[PDB]
Amino acid sequence: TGPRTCKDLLDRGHFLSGWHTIYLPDCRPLTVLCDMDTDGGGWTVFQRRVDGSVDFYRDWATYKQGFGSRLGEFWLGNDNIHALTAQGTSELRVDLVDFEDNYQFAKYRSFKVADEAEKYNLVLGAFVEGSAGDSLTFHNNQSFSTKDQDNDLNTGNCAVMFQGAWWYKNCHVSNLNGRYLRGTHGSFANGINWKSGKGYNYSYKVSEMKVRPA
Amino acid sequence: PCLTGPRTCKDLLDRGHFLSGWHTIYLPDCRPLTVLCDMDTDGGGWTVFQRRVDGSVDFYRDWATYKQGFGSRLGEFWLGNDNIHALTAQGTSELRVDLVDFEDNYQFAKYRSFKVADEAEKYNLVLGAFVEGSAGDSLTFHNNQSFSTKDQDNDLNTGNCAVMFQGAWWYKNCHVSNLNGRYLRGTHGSFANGINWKSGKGYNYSYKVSEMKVRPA
Amino acid sequence: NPCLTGPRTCKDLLDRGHFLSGWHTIYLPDCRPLTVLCDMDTDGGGWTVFQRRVDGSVDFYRDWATYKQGFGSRLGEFWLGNDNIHALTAQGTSELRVDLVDFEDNYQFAKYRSFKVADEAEKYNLVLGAFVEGSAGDSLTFHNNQSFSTKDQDNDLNTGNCAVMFQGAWWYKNCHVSNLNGRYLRGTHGSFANGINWKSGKGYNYSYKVSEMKVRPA
Ligand SMILES: *[C@@H]1O[C@H](CO)[C@@H](O[C@@H]2O[C@H](CO)[C@@H](O)[C@H](O)[C@H]2NC(C)=O)[C@H](O)[C@H]1NC(C)=O
Ligand SMILES: [Ca+2]
Ligand SMILES: [Ca+2]
Ligand SMILES: [Ca+2]
Predict the structure, then answer these.
(1) Please, what are the domains in chain B?
(2) Which residue range or ranges hold the Fibrinogen C-terminal domain (chain C)?
């Protein structure tokens, strides 16, 4: 009866990026950011970093419900991301911009996060292409971890050691919910980092993670 | 008070609206108003009525313009004295003032209650106790004062405070805060005509960000 | 219901008590809903904004199909789309205001008494009324009665391609004195006339920080 994705909104003539209401599988309305420009348009954005205004070093409950601002930076929420990716096949695009306004990206053929009981386990399909290189396949089939809920494969606490929240193993090659450290940083791997892109010592200006039906 | 829809940004937060942004609320029996909800700061659930962030909007405005509200949802605004009255008539809304300097240091001030009276009574400020805040208390001084704009001098100065300090506020013998002042960008030689909070950065420092917001105490 | 009870312009919305600038739904003449940016704050308010530059986040060097449907973001920069702009201006008389801000915080503007863009078959031909006033000076009258041109569809009066030479999309002639869909070059630039330029304002080597083009029924 109503649009189920950003792709449906684009097909109905909504050509400007912006926040729109879609209807989840259980018919629950959810207001989401549609990217109607990048790579054909019709992407639903679930993470956005742009200026460091929002604290991403948050706990399990906050990541679960979503946080931030429609005017800037946000994480849409693990329950919503699960609901968006649970049924069907959604492709993942990651877009990264450095402080000299160079763009890189990574695209994966499928992406989903499982539900809370499986700790928002990441299920990721094949790397398809991207100038940022592949720094997410390494995290496939890992639980999500936050500072207060360590589900990683390190004897210590990765979320604390890298000041983020992610599908940490031992520990990471990407850390996009890390600190907004602004370009090159001496501190090791605690910024908005993508190892195969700018490496463990460069924190991007912009990060966006988004999905679209395959 | 509306039983059929959300009455405040706090109700919206309690119903699972977790992102900050512009939402519709229902004022006391029963007018809809679209407001900016801050769902992050200090528990979330604040309704924002004033916002300065980049100097794009002129705040040196007249009585009619302050009455109806002005600026933009995309940046800087004043929600409007009639809306602010309607929002705080009653009945124990707390006030939080958030200030950010040009080196990205955050300060704030919180008050236990806040309301502005109606246009008759000149949007008189009724302010409760200072509770806490790193910015210090630079608003208690303005308690029980009429609002003044350049074309409507209701202050206790022989001259016109709004003109002398290039703003609009609950001016008395003029002021110790001036958050609707000029966007002067950090330290300024001109006296007390910027976005100033005396007990915070003083009469010669204009903040980068200012937000005034309310929440049921 | 919605079409007939609903606002047709930003001016209607202002008349109904919406005093903050922001994105609202209006209903076009053919009853199609369109979400537009209303400016309620500048010069009496009630303006429908159809172009906005503010930070360089959106690429404006785009093709004919993209300009036709509109592009960018409600959070920042956009072009509303040539079909929408035609639909907004087709019936009656809309005045045009152009607002420009430089990197030193100087505000300039230009106002024109009418502004209309024809439909796709007429290549979104500009029909512009008299210059009324403005501190930016008049750098649009020169473009009157020109087709719109994009890099892949040259309809200008130059032997070459103005949209490519000037890295934009506009009602180019041979070629321009304004280029507000040009590159976001940030203040002074050595490259010639390929920025967000208004000749009579800051000239052919200065790209403004902010650009807004907007219309209101007059
Ligand atoms: C718009 O421009 C067209 C050219 O594109 C003008 O058409 C010419 O008008 C003159 C007299 O004004 C005629 O003698 C020519 O034969 C016309 N040329 C063509 C190709 O049709 C047109 O009149 C201009 N319109 C306005 C309103 O100034
Ligand atoms: Ca561990
Ligand atoms: Ca006086
Ligand atoms: Ca040509």
Answers:
(1) 1-135+209-217 (3.90.215.10), 136-208 (4.10.530.10)
(2) 2-218
